[PDB]
Design an enzyme around this catalytic site. Structure first.
Site, PDB file in Angstrom:
ATOM      1  N   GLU A   1       0.642  -1.271  -0.023  1.00  0.00           N
ATOM      2  CA  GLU A   1      -0.087   0.139  -0.139  1.00  0.00           C
ATOM      3  C   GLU A   1       0.860   1.218   0.071  1.00  0.00           C
ATOM      4  OE1 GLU A   1      -3.015   0.397  -0.523  1.00  0.00           O
ATOM      5  OE2 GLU A   1      -3.916  -1.709  -0.115  1.00  0.00           O
TER       6      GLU A   1
ATOM      7  N   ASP B   1      -6.446   8.167  -0.773  1.00  0.00           N
ATOM      8  CA  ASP B   1      -5.778   7.249   0.330  1.00  0.00           C
ATOM      9  C   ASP B   1      -4.637   7.928   0.883  1.00  0.00           C
ATOM     10  OD1 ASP B   1      -7.505   5.110  -0.801  1.00  0.00           O
ATOM     11  OD2 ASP B   1      -6.181   4.090  -1.645  1.00  0.00           O
TER      12      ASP B   1
ATOM     13  N   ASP C   1     -15.478  -4.731   8.977  1.00  0.00           N
ATOM     14  CA  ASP C   1     -16.834  -4.135   8.161  1.00  0.00           C
ATOM     15  C   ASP C   1     -17.314  -5.368   7.287  1.00  0.00           C
ATOM     16  OD1 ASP C   1     -18.080  -1.601   7.256  1.00  0.00           O
ATOM     17  OD2 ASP C   1     -17.207  -2.210   5.233  1.00  0.00           O
TER      18      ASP C   1
END
Length: 129
Positions: free
Chosen positions: A35, A52, A101
């Site tokens: 990432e 992001d 989530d």
């Protein structure tokens, strides 16, 4: 801050990510590698206009407020700039919400595409943890 690999491993572990929602520490280290390259200051605009932020590239449409993403929900209740700090606390707390989530670590596209199904324990090799 650009973390070293084992430095990040140790900080993630201190903050309770090892085995969080069943994901071993190597998964988290691998996700951060792909990432952000372990750089807390990393930012990358997404096509939808969100951005992001941070070591785990957390998005401004759902999770944090950056003041420029229409529809922002700010579910982590933080400014996105908190995710850029040398202190990873805010990123970790938010990542714990994200991974809870429904889709687990599939929420991180780089984890799905570059970590999932691989020998993630390689990412903690050599570390004194």
């Amino acid at each position: 801050k650009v973390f070293g690999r084992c430095e990040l491993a140790a900080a993630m572990k201190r903050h309770g990510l090892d085995n969080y929602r069943g994901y071993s520490l190597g998964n988290w280290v691998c996700a951060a590698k792909f990432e952000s390259n372990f750089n807390t200051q990393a930012t990358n605009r997404n096509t939808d206009g969100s951005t992001d932020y941070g070591i785990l590239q957390i998005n401004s449409r759902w999770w944090c407020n950056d003041g420029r993403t229409p529809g922002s929900r700010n579910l982590c209740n933080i400014p996105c700039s908190a995710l850029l700090s040398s202190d990873i606390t805010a990123s970790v707390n938010c990542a714990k919400k994200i991974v809870s989530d429904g889709n687990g670590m599939n929420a991180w596209v780089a984890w799905r595409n570059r970590c999932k199904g691989t020998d993630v324990q390689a990412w903690i090799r050599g570390c004194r943890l």
